Each structure stands twice: as C-alpha cells, then as structure tokens.
Amino acid sequence: NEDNARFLLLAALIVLYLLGGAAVFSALELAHERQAKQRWEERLAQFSRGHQLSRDELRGFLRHYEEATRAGIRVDNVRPRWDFTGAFYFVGTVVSTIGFGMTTPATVGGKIFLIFYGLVGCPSTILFFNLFLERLITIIAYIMKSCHQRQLRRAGWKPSVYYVMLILCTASILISCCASAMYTPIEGWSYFDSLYFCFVAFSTIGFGDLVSSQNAHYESQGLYRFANFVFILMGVCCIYSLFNVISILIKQSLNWILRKMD
Amino acid sequence: NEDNARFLLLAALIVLYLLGGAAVFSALELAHERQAKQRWEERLAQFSRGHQLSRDELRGFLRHYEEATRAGIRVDNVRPRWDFTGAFYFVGTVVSTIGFGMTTPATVGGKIFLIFYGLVGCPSTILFFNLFLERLITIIAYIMKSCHQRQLRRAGWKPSVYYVMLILCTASILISCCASAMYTPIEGWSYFDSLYFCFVAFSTIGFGDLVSSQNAHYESQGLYRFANFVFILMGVCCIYSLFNVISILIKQSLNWILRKMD
Numbered sequence A, B: 001n002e003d004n005a006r007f008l009l010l011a012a013l014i015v016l017y018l019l020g021g022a023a024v025f026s027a028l029e030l031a032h033e034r035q036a037k038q039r040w041e042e043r044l045a046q047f048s049r050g051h052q053l054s055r056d057e058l059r060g061f062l063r064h065y066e067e068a069t070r071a072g073i074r075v076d077n078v079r080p081r082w083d084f085t086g087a088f089y090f091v092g093t094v095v096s097t098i099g100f101g102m103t104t105p106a107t108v109g110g111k112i113f114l115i116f117y118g119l120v121g122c123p124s125t126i127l128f129f130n131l132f133l134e135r136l137i138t139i140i141a142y143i144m145k146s147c148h149q150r151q152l153r154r155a156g157w158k159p160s161v162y163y164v165m166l167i168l169c170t171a172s173i174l175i176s177c178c179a180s181a182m183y184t185p186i187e188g189w190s191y192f193d194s195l196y197f198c199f200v201a202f203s204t205i206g207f208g209d210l211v212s213s214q215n216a217h218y219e220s221q222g223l224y225r226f227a228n229f230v231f232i233l234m235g236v237c238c239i240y241s242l243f244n245v246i247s248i249l250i251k252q253s254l255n256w257i258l259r260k261m262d
C-alpha cells in the first residue's frame, strides 16, 4: 500500500505542477504573442496595399513558401539537407532523442527506416549514458580514496548521491559556459541565447528555434562541426546523469513525506 | 578491465551505426530534396515575373513572414498560443522532453522560467515512468501467479525480461493502432502518417513536422483534447519502458560477446 501511495502522490504533485506552470507561462507570454500577431497583420496589409495585390494571391504564395520551408528552403543560405554531413547530423539528433526538426524525412521509405533505426538505436544511447555514469562514479571513488591515502602520509569509498549531484551540476555549468563562449562569436547570438540553446539541447527537449551549424559557409567549418559534436555529446551525458540523480533524490523526498504523514 | 572493454565496444558500435544510418538516409532523401528545391525555385520565379515584383521585395516579405511564423502565425487557422490551453500543451511537451517546437518562449523571463521549470520537472516525470514500470511488473507477476494457481486445480513469480519486452511491444502496437484509429478522420491524415506521428511523439523525439490537436475549431474539441492527452501519456510510458528493457537486453548481449572474444 506504500508503493501505491507514492505513485498517487507523485501523480497529484505533477498535475499541480503542470497547472501552475501553464498559468505562469501564459501570464508571461500572452501579451507578446498578441503584439507580434498585430505587427505581422499590419505589415501584411501594408505590403498588400503598396503593390495592389490580392489577399488570395499572397495566401497562395505563402502556402507555397511553407511547403518549400518544410522541404528545407530558408531565407539565409542554409546548408544543404540530406548530404552525408546533414544526414550524420540528423541521425545524431535522432538517436539522442533531441529531434531539432530542422531536417525530417519526407518520403515513404525514409519514414519506415526512421522507425526501425530509432527503435534499434535509442536503447543503445541510453545504455551508453548509463555506462558513462557508472564509470564516472567509479573514477570519483578512486580519486577520493587515492587523495585520502596520500594525505594520510603526514571499494568502500563510493560517494553519496549529494556529492555526485553537486559534481554533475558543476560539470554541466562549466560545459554550458564553455560551449556558449564559442557559439556566441561564431553565431550571431547573444550569450544568454547561447546558454538557453545549450540547456534546450542538452536536456533533449530540442525545440528547434535555435540550431547551431546551419549557415552553409562557416569559415573553418572543419573543426567547428567536430567541436559542436563533442560539446553536444558531453552536455547530453552530463544532463542525463544529473536528471537521474535528481530523480533519486525526489524519490527519497517522497518516502520521507509519506513516512511523516500518518 | 571488463567494464572499460564494454564501454569501448559500445562506443565503436554506436559510431558505426551512425555512419551507416547517415549513408542510408542521404541515399534515400537527396533526390527528393533537390527536386523540391527546384520546384520552389520555379514557383518563385514564376510568381515574381507575373506581378513585376523585384526579388528584394519578395525577400523582405518572406523574411517578415518567417518572423511572424516564429510567433505562431500560419496560413491556415490555428489555435492561439499561450491563452491557457496552449500553455498546458507546451508544459506537457516540456516536462516529457518531447519538445514539438510549435510553441516556444519568445521573451526574457519566459526563458529563465523555462530553464528552472524544466530542471525541476523532467526528473519528476522520469521517476513517474520508473514507478509505472515497477507497478506494471508487479501486476504481471500477480496475474501469472493467479493464473497458475487457478490452473493447478485440475513474490518469486516475477517474469523474465524477455516476456516483459514482448508485453510492452504488444501494448505499444495496440496503443499506436488505437490512437491512429482517430487522428485520421479528425486530422485528415493518412493512416501511415498517423502511425509515424505516434512513433515520433511516443519516443520523445518530437520533430514537430506533424503536431496534433491545433486547428482552431475541432468539432467537440472538449473530449478530443482529453483523448489526445491520454493517448500521448500512455504511449510515452510504454515506449520509455520498452526502451529501458531493450537496453538491458543489449547489455546482456554485449557481456556475452565480450565473453566470446575471450
């Protein structure tokens, strides 16, 4: 009866969390959304009046442009999709569950293979992340044991969950700052935008509003792609481990809550 | 030295998998991409000639349209973002790490809160999925014990990983087929497109090319949203559990191959 109680309590807490978050986000974003819509409508009306076109013709043109954009066309010299490098980027975003969406299959055959590829590939990445976490814990224990032994001259050393969480948080912060230091100059982004993109990509949410390495010519462009790959990989690993540790802590907190209640 | 060997072997296998997948996807998609780009270019050239519009004017108009679309505008009628139910949909896609991207924060304050909200919410959903998996295993064991006891008239009953994987696969197939039973007449999609969307959403990849339940008016629109919520929740749970079980099986296969290599 304890497991059922914990399950029910977690469900109720998550529901309340969702309701509160929805309220807050609406309060923050509604006015900006309305203002943007009004500005776009004014621009469209002015353009239509200037060149004495028709609303239907512009509607058809915009529909064609939306189809082209789904195809992969953009307005600023984007890199080609579905070349070998683009395909590599797409598969990397698929196996990790990020799914930016800047490149998606468009033909029958490219969707079946996507299903099978993801089905056989996502578990492998999850297993890789788990193995990395285990290796990190072992190395931390070894370092602590060695440091204590060396300082004495003046296995059972597994660190607690709290220290592992602190270490993962520090590593994530450092990786995000280092990645942003490179994204900001190469891209036309601000530092805060770089941090926001780093968090969105590392957590595997992948909205797709900001995507890196999509500007065709990128000066060097040889080391830049390798650096982007390395940074995304490390960030994903660190954030995945941090989320799992935080989940363990939340589970302990829920038991404590249940135990206190009586 | 065994753990390091398994780690290295998994890394090499994943790298080969990525290379092969990239090659296959490029081979499948490059011709379609080129044809679509050519068709869009022809359409744009034809439109420009007919109305005597300069290409810079059309470029500016399309840039404005891309800015507007980034705020939620579409050629077809779509439900508003950030009123109260768009916010609920957004938070649901955020906590589950799906990230469709049809709704994204656009203001400072809506991005900081997004970071903190995700940081505190994703671990809760992961814990909920793990608890669900444990409950499912317990119920399966109880059912098997009861069935065996009944068949006798003529704890240690937990099923093996193989049977749990088979059950999860069957449940996922049934849920996907039932969900696609709708989403075909309500969304005007083909059945295969419905299955593709179900897999993309359930796995938490969330490309965003196909998003459900946003067409402004949706007939009832009261039960439809509830049904969409329930279907997505169940699919996400089942696919998450299936991925974890498959990862365990892959780990066993790796240990066996390592033992085979001596």
Ligand SMILES: CCCCC/C=C\C/C=C\CCCCCCCC(=O)O
Binding pocket: A085, A088, A089, A092, A093, A095, A096, A125, A128, A213, A224, A225, A226, A228, A229, A232, A233, A236, B011, B012, B014, B015
């Ligand atoms: C060497 C370690 C092997 C393990 C690989 C495991 C998982 C891969 C997961 C995610 C990769 C992040 C996306 C890379 C994007 C390529 C960028 C570019 O090309 O511009």
Ligand SMILES: CCCCC/C=C\C/C=C\CCCCCCCC(=O)O
Binding pocket: A011, A012, A014, A015, B085, B088, B089, B092, B093, B095, B096, B125, B128, B213, B224, B225, B226, B228, B229, B232, B233, B236
């Ligand atoms: C009662 C169980 C509580 C636990 C819920 C936990 C996590 C929620 C995760 C995913 C739900 C995503 C569905 C998207 C919302 C659709 C709403 C709509 O179409 O408008």
Ligand SMILES: CCCCCCCCCCCCCCCC
Binding pocket: A013, A014, A017, A250, A252, A253, A254, A256, B120, B124
């Ligand atoms: C969305 C889930 C919210 C998580 C609720 C956190 C509960 C806080 C309890 C903190 C005390 C538990 C730690 C042990 C105290 C000795």
Ligand SMILES: CCCCCCCCCCCCCCCC
Binding pocket: A120, A121, A124, B013, B014, B017, B250, B252, B253, B254, B256, B257
């Ligand atoms: C993306 C990497 C996938 C690697 C899958 C490895 C498959 C190995 C098959 C081995 C089958 C025998 C194992 C079961 C015997 C105990």
Ligand SMILES: CCCCCCCCCCCC
Binding pocket: A085, A221, A222, A225, A226, B015
């Ligand atoms: C144009 C060069 C792109 C480089 C990205 C591919 C190489 C990384 C995969 C191999 C890592 C061991």
Ligand SMILES: CCCCCCCCCCCC
Binding pocket: A219, A220, A223, A224, A226, A227, A230
């Ligand atoms: C204009 C030169 C930009 C090149 C950026 C170099 C990126 C490599 C950093 C180190 C890789 C880990």
Ligand SMILES: CCCCCCCCCCCC
Binding pocket: B004, B007, B008, B011
């Ligand atoms: C003996 C130790 C060397 C092999 C372990 C390294 C495998 C990962 C290297 C790349 C970082 C993900």
Ligand SMILES: CCCCCCCCCCCC
Binding pocket: B085, B221, B222, B225, B226
């Ligand atoms: C217990 C489930 C709580 C969430 C219900 C909200 C979704 C229904 C939307 C109805 C809007 C007309």
Ligand SMILES: CCCCCCCCCCCC
Binding pocket: B219, B220, B223, B224, B226, B227, B230
């Ligand atoms: C006319 C459109 C009616 C569609 C309503 C959907 C009914 C689904 C309810 C069951 C939820 C699991």
Ligand SMILES: CCCCCCCCCCCC
Binding pocket: A004, A007, A008, A011, B132, B233, B234, B237
């Ligand atoms: C005894 C009842 C406790 C469990 C009820 C929780 C119902 C939530 C269903 C969510 C399944 C994905």
Ligand SMILES: CCCCCCCC
Binding pocket: A109, A112, A113, A116
């Ligand atoms: C038309 C190519 C078919 C690709 C699907 C392969 C599934 C194993």
Ligand SMILES: CCCCCCCC
Binding pocket: A135, A139, B004
């Ligand atoms: C025993 C060596 C473990 C490898 C750790 C690598 C972390 C970047």
Ligand SMILES: CCCCCCCC
Binding pocket: A178, A181, A182, A185
């Ligand atoms: C840590 C990488 C620093 C890159 C600086 C780029 C300056 C043009």
Ligand SMILES: CCCCCCCC
Binding pocket: A222, A223, A226
């Ligand atoms: C000019 C391309 C350099 C690629 C670096 C790869 C390092 C293993």
Ligand SMILES: CCCCCCCC
Binding pocket: B109, B112, B113, B116
């Ligand atoms: C303008 C109000 C922003 C509040 C940010 C939320 C901090 C947790």
Ligand SMILES: CCCCCCCC
Binding pocket: B135, B136, B139
């Ligand atoms: C005793 C188990 C009850 C909860 C399981 C519900 C599965 C849908």
